[PDB]
Design a protein around this ligand. Structure first.
Ligand SMILES: [Pd+2]
Ligand SMILES: [Pd+2]
Ligand SMILES: [Pd+2]
Ligand SMILES: [Pd+2]
Ligand SMILES: [Pd+2]
Ligand SMILES: [Pd+2]
Ligand SMILES: [Pd+2]
Ligand SMILES: [Pd+2]
Ligand SMILES: [Pd+2]
Ligand SMILES: [Pd+2]
Lengths: 172, 172, 172, 172, 172
């Protein structure tokens, strides 16, 4: 290094883990994105929603890696586990799986902020705030909104509701 | 001629047949296009979808004919059989008939490419690639997507789903 | 006069009657237009569709009156009977009543053309062609298209279909 | 239907026949268009002249089909016979065959107008006037002009005249 | 090298030969181009037609050489034989010699594609397709068209036809 200052080995390690988490989340969204582009699923707006998220999670991993280098920490990459599912069911199933995924990332961010606080590392605490914490809260709110609307559309005709939600809410 | 080189009589004949196939497909789509413009059918977006395809298949026949002349082959036209139906039923029925039609054209293209390969005619093989093969794959994918969405909309209220699909997917 | 030439008293009288018919049709559409603007009916697109027709039928009467003066005939106005209904029921009911109304105007136009032919009055025959006959055919076709779509939307949930048709077909 | 008014079964049938005629004429011009693009014929302006006509005749069939639906008639398609020739000889031969073809279409239009008159169908009579009758007269006049100029160029050197006509009159 | 992969010595050698062929063809067209600029020949459009081809064949050799380096093959240049003639006779003679030349290049391209296929070298097969095969087919078609028109103009007055072709087809 030569630059490292007030940056604990504990935070460095947690940041590398959080990179793996974000990359895993990107991979999961990549899978979701292609599943909804299958000719037997064919929900364009849902596919684009998840493809967009795959890109956001990748960008989050890259921002963490840049920060790791800015602090004099060292990136360490691990094997990326495949997503939990090969097929993702309905839009409802997928949005449920998405909120749980996001909740898990948010909790990892909270655990890291807690560690930053315990380690008296305010640069970390700020970094997470501006790039990650508020973004997660806004995203989880949106998914909750979507889940509520998906659920109101289930009714007795599930196909009709799945079509209308994709057409009228997720418009490409 | 004076220009013909490496262009077998077998390929020349197959190209003339494929022209007839494409023209037949154009005629079929012309019929479909007008059927959905009937006052007792009246699905504007479906009519435009098939009218657009009638034009594409005609253009495909014309490109084959131009290629036939470029190679020194001779166009031979045959009687064009009328479409298989006078009335085409629902949007679902029509999209089903469309995919089968496209599959039959795609298989004719594949048979011709195979013949090109057996005849060692790379100009042919390339021509088909760029103008026909990838276009068919994209088109069949789209029709599969449409079929999936049509089918999800059938539910218990078929009229409602047929209206919504035309309004929200085929928007003119 | 001083200008009247080849213009029979029979045609002059029929033209005055046709003016009354067109004005009556305008009045009927005026009533329809306001009925769909009632707070307990409230179908904006349907209201605008009929208001637009009230204006078209008025313009048709004015064109006939201008022609009457161009030929040296004399406008004679009669009492305008009120519309056949005070309340018009559903969009379906109204579109049914509209097509019958239009059919009755079209038949009056046909009867007048027949009279023009019997009276050897080609200026009349042409006038009706360009301003009235083709317009009626296009309009009746459109109403037939609408009726078909309204009817497909009735299903088991009439309110839903009436709302969707107004929102998605009659968009203001 | 629900819209059909003053539209006889005789006219409906004649319109379907006239569609077949126009489509046949389009096919004939398509054949002519490609024949003049053969490397051993190679008269660019003549090819474009006939290709342009193939498109015009197709558009004429489509306008008739649209009108058939506007009146509440039902399109019925028949097998399209191949053109009368596989090879078309000289520009002269082709222009001679073109005028006869056009004369045959014009006579079909005249027969249909006569039927419209006998059936007291002024909408038909007008439709044919504006879209077909005057167009045929202008086109036949042009072909007559071309035939006269082709014939003056035959002389003792037929190749020279055929080249000059294509270069100087049919300029692409 | 360090980059060479799936690139046989047989293909490398054939590519070097094809470079020599293309350069020879450029030289031949250079000779043709200047012959038609002689004060006692003086056919401007014919000169420009061949000068343009000299440049195209040179560009083809350069594209092959670039590809040879892209694959890790090594350019080897050989003595360039002078053209088969010092004087080229009529436009007809020259266009005849041009088509034979082009046919010989096309056959070399076909032989190389065949070799690519036997050597399982798809990058080669594609390269030839896009840059060479379709270009040759279009060019040979054009020369066939020209030959047909030249021949129709010979008549009984060869000078007149040679002048008219240069003026009216090869316009600079
Ligand atoms: Pd999409
Ligand atoms: Pd999309
Ligand atoms: Pd439409
Ligand atoms: Pd439309
Ligand atoms: Pd309104
Ligand atoms: Pd409104
Ligand atoms: Pd051309
Ligand atoms: Pd041209
Ligand atoms: Pd020059
Ligand atoms: Pd010059």
């Amino acid at each position: 290094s030569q630059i490292r200052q007030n940056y604990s080995t504990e935070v460095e390690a947690a940041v590398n883990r959080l990179v793996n988490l974000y990359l895993r989340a990107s991979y999961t969204y990549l899978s979701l994105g292609f599943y909804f582009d299958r000719d037997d699923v064919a929900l364009c707006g849902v596919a684009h929603f998840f493809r967009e998220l795959a890109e956001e999670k990748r960008e989050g991993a890259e921002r963490l890696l840049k920060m790791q280098n800015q602090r004099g920490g060292r990136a360490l990459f691990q094997d990326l586990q495949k997503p939990s599912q090969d097929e993702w069911g309905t839009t409802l199933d997928a949005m449920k799986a998405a909120i749980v995924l996001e909740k898990s990332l948010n909790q990892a961010l909270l655990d890291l902020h807690a560690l930053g606080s315990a380690q008296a590392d305010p640069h970390l605490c700020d970094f997470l705030e501006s790039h990650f914490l508020d973004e997660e809260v806004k995203l989880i709110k949106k998914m909750g909104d979507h889940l509520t609307n998906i659920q109101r559309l289930v009714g007795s005709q599930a196909g009709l509701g799945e079509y209308l939600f994709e057409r009228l809410t997720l418009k490409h």
